[PDB]
Ligand binder design. Structure first.
Ligand code: DOL
Ligand code: DOL
Ligand code: DOL
Lengths: 204, 204, 204
């Protein structure tokens, strides 16, 4: 029961909702989970939303399963960073002899990898800056600009984005993070979808 | 004297300025005042700026008179809200038996109506969140994201948007509020335009 | 040695990077320095990023040398300001008799000129409001909305943008602002590029 987790366009008669995994299976350094989807703004594919991602920098992007990515969302990788121990002018890129001035292995600090958890809801036109992490069950308000990490099951928003409120109580979050319903077999999930929607899955 | 309040494009030689009322008089659940206008960004008509507005949700949009709306301003209605008491995943939307997991209207958050007062100036590319109320004579700095109510005759800006300062003294605001020059017959307004532009109408 | 400071498209095989000076050479009230460049978002030329710049107001735009402007950056001049001593409604624009209500020379306060210094890096999609001043060697985070001035060699971001950190210590900044490597003859610069990149040029 349900949509095929490996179909680029799960809903025929709607070429806007797309499954991310089947589309990003070809990309290097990008691990994406099943059922996570993207809501296109003008027909573009999610791969066009990943920016400044260069294999030579070795940074990686990780997206969990069952995520909701609104239209216009953008993920910024480490390619945007300029040198900062002196001038920020990229002499090297202009060539004609300036290519001598290319940064050495240790003069381009890296902020780290980008990992988005499971069951995460990202609003419209949100911008993700390099190296940030987002915990499971988090909700990011539309038009946010995230520079710092966001704890699991939190409500964040703004520019810069800040934590606004806890979705549930600690004990509930603790249990939810321990059962990880998203890793269950598809058949088991189907028999509990309701309990997952009302948060009663922590009881049974 | 003055432009025709019911012409789509009141200014000959300017296919950018539009009177909103004539444009949006066809829409369901949208109530707009006269003389309020929109400055087109690329030729689009203000209707394309109202997002996630569905008749089934019963939320209404109200805009006052004599308002100035900058280019790119968008208004987000309640249609963007996901279910929040559990997982934010929209199972129902994928079909294949999942349609049975469709939420009732009682299980969807309702933030209320969106109400814009009279004589309001909204800056370029401002985003308005659902259920927001903006008082008369208020000013919203460009590029703002409004998530909470804004008092009358207040200058707000930012993301999230916050109140910056009172345009005038309290007694002045109180006087303006119970005068409502915008409700005067057009011929009376014409003979007081200069007095309205300098705040001396409080001296009559 | 290096690229031609007078070539619209300095890099062969990349019609995105463009030199500002040659492109804005036609504009009145716009002065831009050598080597400062723009990274095009969709093939658009930088002149399309300067908004509300009206000769009648006489406000000027000044950009220094050796700057790095990210894609989508827009500069808002004084043509956006509305009258604020009373109603913000621009009666005058609609004509048909209301043209007689046109602000006097002193009924439209002006926030001043917009001056960006030398060696400054402005992030992607950053918006610059009217009258702001940005000192040399300052870094502006992407997606920022700058409403107030930024001091030399400071890091600022947010909406509204705030100064986050001082890149170096006072003595260093003081020394840098005193030598102004950006004003040296191109030949002398070429023999110190590496020294400029690691801030060792202060000890010569
Ligand atoms: C032979 C390699 N090719 C194929 C022809 C190009 C791929 S690349 O890895 O050399 C890439 C090109 C320039 N850099 C850009 O990000 C880039 C290139 O053009 C542009 N950016 C246009 C801009 O994006 C201007 C921007 O201001 C430049 C930025 C933000 C530079 C940030 C600092 N860049 C680096 O530290 C450069 C590292 C070098 C070593 C190269 C690799 C060869 C290692 O990687 C790039 O980022 C490189
Ligand atoms: C038979 C009814 N039709 C005609 C065929 C569709 C109209 S609808 O009212 O069922 C509409 C379709 C899906 N929902 C969307 O907003 C929508 C549909 O496709 C898309 N959105 C593409 C997206 O917008 C993906 C997006 O991420 C989905 C969102 C933001 C869902 C938010 C939560 N949605 C609701 O709570 C769904 C409520 C149901 C009950 C339906 C009505 C039948 C009541 O309304 C919709 O919002 C429904
Ligand atoms: C005869 C003069 N012409 C040729 C026909 C027009 C040039 S203009 O200098 O009168 C110009 C027209 C309206 N203003 C606009 O910014 C403008 C005109 O249409 C539009 N903007 C569409 C919009 O840009 C809507 C926008 O919301 C209007 C803005 C942001 C108004 C801000 C406040 N405007 C001023 O204070 C008006 C000053 C007057 C005096 C006029 C000059 C005659 C002095 O300048 C403009 O800014 C004027």
């Amino acid at each position: 029961m349900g949509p095929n987790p490996m179909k680029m366009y799960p809903i025929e008669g709607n070429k806007s909702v797309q499954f991310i995994k089947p589309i990003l299976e070809k990309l290097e350094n990008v691990e994406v989970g099943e059922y996570s989807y993207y809501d296109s703004k003008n027909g573009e594919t999610f791969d066009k939303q990943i920016l400044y991602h260069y294999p030579i920098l070795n940074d990686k992007l990780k997206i969990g399963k069952f995520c909701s990515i609104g239209p216009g969302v953008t993920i910024i990788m480490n390619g945007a960073n300029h040198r900062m121990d002196g001038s920020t002018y990229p002499f090297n890129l202009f060539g004609n002899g300036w290519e001598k001035h290319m940064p050495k292995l240790d003069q381009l600090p890296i902020k780290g990898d980008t990992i988005i958890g499971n069951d995460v809801w990202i609003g419209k036109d949100v911008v993700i800056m390099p190296g940030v992490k987002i915990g499971d069950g988090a909700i990011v308000a539309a038009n946010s600009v995230v520079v710092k990490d966001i704890a699991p099951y939190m409500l964040a928003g703004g520019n810069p984005a800040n934590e606004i409120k806890q979705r549930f109580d600690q004990d509930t979050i603790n249990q939810l993070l321990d059962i990880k319903w998203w890793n269950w077999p598809i058949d088991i999930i189907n028999e509990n979808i309701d309990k997952i929607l009302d948060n009663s899955i922590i009881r049974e």
